[PDB]
Amino acid sequence: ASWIKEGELSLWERFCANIIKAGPMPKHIAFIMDGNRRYAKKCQVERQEGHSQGFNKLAETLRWCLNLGILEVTVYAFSIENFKRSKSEVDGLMDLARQKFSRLMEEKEKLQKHGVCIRVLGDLHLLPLDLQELIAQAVQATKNYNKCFLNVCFAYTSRHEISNAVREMAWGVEQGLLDPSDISESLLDKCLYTNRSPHPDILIRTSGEVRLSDFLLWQTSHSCLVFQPVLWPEYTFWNLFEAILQFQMNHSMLQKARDMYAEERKRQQLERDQATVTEQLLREGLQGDAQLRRTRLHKLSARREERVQGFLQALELKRADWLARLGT
Amino acid sequence: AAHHRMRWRADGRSLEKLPVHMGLVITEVEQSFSDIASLVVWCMAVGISYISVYDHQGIFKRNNSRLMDEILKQQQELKDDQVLNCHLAVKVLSPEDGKADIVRAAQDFCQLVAQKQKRPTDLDVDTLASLLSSNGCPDPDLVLKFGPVDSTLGFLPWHIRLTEIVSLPSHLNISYEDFFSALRQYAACEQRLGK
Ligand SMILES: C=C(C)CCOP(=O)(O)OP(=O)(O)O
Ligand SMILES: C=C(C)CCOP(=O)(O)OP(=O)(O)O
Ligand SMILES: [Mg+2]
């Protein structure tokens, strides 16, 4: 089927949505679409149909999200861990991906009309070369759309994403763009595949499984974890609705927590900074009553701002470069 | 009565599997040390090697001694070798043990990059994992989350990638049977590891 499944919410869906939209609504939901194989078994159907049904549900689910005014959605489609499955299965999964990403071109009309930007996050170099090219074109085609964001995590793990992000800032070091003392929380954030997106308000996993399975570990540390027993291909609007209801119940507490953590980080930063300014001034001699420390603080800050902004534009470069090269 | 040490070891040996490393995450911010201490010693009694204790407000970090005080007390009922075995097996954590520590390690690798000692390319997953180990401490297999919040709230994001997360509404009056129920849950879980 298509990628965009145009559907108007029904009466009860519509009504319950209105009541819910009165409270805090998530801006970004992420999904571990797990349980396709158990579903196929349950339905006495072939494995591949299970995964195909899984893709159908993703298309249906994105429409639900769009109808609720939730503009960003991240999904886990394929883990690096998944390569260890039988060649039969992974070839099947790889073929599915080819099919869907190829069909995306024939849907350019609906993509513009609906304004859906598609990003594919992972260690893509591990995929078959044909698939990389396919994905790359898909990404380039939608890059300028803005009404709805879908992030498909393919050949992805969290650890890989994290390592990659540190490697990227070690590359900044080797390329003399980054000095060790500039590596921080923010900078790491900004070197993840997910850097264009805010952290997900909700993370949902569909099997009865109570593990994250190496998914958005950094991004979902302060987010609402919802584990629902339903197998992914059987997901319903109401499952989603229950997720949002959990989010709304947790919202106040998770906000307090998120601010506390932010306030404590700015504190522990202004602390570790003010101290660096001390060693320098004690070793120099002069030590204040004419805003001496205050001026050394503006400096260390602006040094970072200029030099991190510099590292960033060069990282964006390198990403676009590999995007253009592999999607030509 | 010492037939209680034999019982608790029998309970552990009886489960299909036990966590080598258990995490205890407390989310509750309404108000309590004896309960947490009871959990810790139960863990030790059944045969769990490591126990982490975590709260997002760092209350336990700031109260390490008062906590280890109760643990050592509760532990004897059911001195220096006993103090060493709790320090080894029990870790008290706050947020700074999570992401901040990953930044910490990131920095330690970028100086080796400045030193022309290491190339960016040398940092696979496994290297980062090593830079992020203790000694014996593996990744926690089971985290018992207590309280109303559906979040790990910053608990070891890196290490928590395959951890089974079991939720209990409160730690306030926690019973052994309630604790063991969680262990039975973990023992029955299926781990596919991507296959
Ligand atoms: C590509 C993936 C991993 C889709 C999730 O469903 P599964 O393939 O994991 O099916 P289950 O074994 O979880 O039922
Ligand atoms: C793309 C998805 C949904 C991956 C989920 O992984 P699994 O279904 O393979 O994870 P485990 O249960 O084996 O840990
Ligand atoms: Mg599975």
> What CATH number is given to the structural domain containing B142?
3.40.1180.10
Query: Quick check: A180 and B114 CB within 8 A?
Result: yes
Structure tokens at B183: 């262990």
**Triad A274, A301, A256: Cα angle to 5°:** 75
Assess if residue B110 is contained within a domain. Answer: no
Q: Which residues contact B188 (CB under 8 A, 6 or more apart)?
A: B16
Q: Which CATH superfamily is domain A11-157+196-267 in?
A: Decaprenyl diphosphate synthase-like (3.40.1180.10)
Does the annotation list B72 as a binding residue? no
Assess if residue B48 is contained within a domain. Answer: yes
* Strands of the B164-168 sheet, one edge to the other: B90-93, B50-55, B21-26, B142-146, B164-168
Q: Would the CB of A76 count as within 6 Å of ligand 2?
A: yes
Residue A11, φ and ψ in degrees, nearest 5: -60, -55
Query: Quick check: B99 and A185 CB within 8 A?
Result: yes
Measured between alpha carbons, how far is A222 from A202 in angstroms, rounded to an integer?
9
Chain B within 8 Å of A30 (Cβ-Cβ)? Answer: no
Q: Kindly state the DSSP code that residue A26 receives in the 8-state scheme.
A: -
Q: Kindly state the DSSP code that residue A107 receives in the 8-state scheme.
A: T
Assess if residue B129 is contained within a domain. Answer: no
User: How many alpha carbons lie under 13 Å from residue A147 in its C-beta half-sphere?
Assistant: 12
Measured between alpha carbons, how far is A238 from A47 in angstroms, rounded to an integer?
26
**Which one, of B125, B131, B127, B185, lies nearest residue B161 by Cα?**
B125
Minimum-distance ligand to the CA of A153?
A: 2
Q: Residue A116 forms beta bridges with which residues?
A: A148
Assess if residue B40 is contained within a domain. Answer: yes
User: What is the number of other CB atoms lying within 10 angstroms of the CB of residue A205?
Assistant: 23
Give, rounded to a whole angstrom, the gap between the first and last alpha carbons of chain B.
46
Kindly tell me the sign of the dihedral angle through the C-alpha atoms of A121, A122, A123, A126. Answer: negative
Structure tokens at A69: 């005014």
Structure tokens at A148: 């709805």
Experimental technique: X-ray
Measured between alpha carbons, how far is A26 from B139 in angstroms, rounded to an integer?
31
Q: Which helix (H) or strand (E) holds A193?
A: none
Residues of A whose CB is below 8 A from B124: 163
Measured between alpha carbons, how far is A113 from A147 in angstroms, rounded to an integer?
9
Kindly tell me the sign of the dihedral angle through the C-alpha atoms of A91, A97, A99, A105. Answer: negative
Residues A106 and A82 sit within 8 Å (Cβ to Cβ): no
Residues of A whose CB is below 8 A from B23: none
Assess if residue B80 is contained within a domain. Answer: yes
Cα dihedral A210/A213/A216/A221 (nearest 10):
40
H-type alpha helices, A21-128 = 36-42, 47-67, 87-105, 108-114
Q: Which residues contact B173 (CB under 8 A, 6 or more apart)?
A: B35
Residues B142 and B20 sit within 8 Å (Cβ to Cβ): no
Structure tokens at B148: 């109303």
- DSSP string across B17-72: ---SEEEEEE-------HHHHHHHHHHHHHT-SEEEEEETT-TTGGGHHHHHHHHH
Q: Kindly state the DSSP code that residue A77 receives in the 8-state scheme.
A: E
Residues A93 and A51 sit within 8 Å (Cβ to Cβ): yes
Structure tokens at B192: 């596919």
Angle between helices B64-77 and B34-46 (to 10 degrees): 50
- Secondary-structure percent of chain B, ordered helix, strand, coil, rounded to 5: 45, 15, 40
Assess if residue B105 is contained within a domain. Answer: no
Q: Chain A: residue nearest B153 by CA? A: A222
Interface of A with B in 134-163 (CB under 8 A): 157-160, 162-163
Residues A275 and A296 sit within 8 Å (Cβ to Cβ): no
User: How many alpha carbons lie under 13 Å from residue B194 in its C-beta half-sphere?
Assistant: 19
Measured between alpha carbons, how far is A7 from A296 in angstroms, rounded to an integer?
58
| Antiparallel, parallel or unpaired: β A72-79 and A28-32 | parallel
Measured between alpha carbons, how far is B73 from B33 in angstroms, rounded to an integer?
11
Q: Nearest C-alpha of chain A: how many angstroms from B105?
A: 9
Kindly tell me the sign of the dihedral angle through the C-alpha atoms of A38, A42, A47, A51. Answer: negative
User: What is the tally of structural domains in chain B?
Assistant: 1
Q: Which residues contact A2 (CB under 8 A, 6 or more apart)?
A: A59, A103, A107, A110
Greatest Cα-to-Cα distance within chain A, rounded to the nearest angstrom: 80
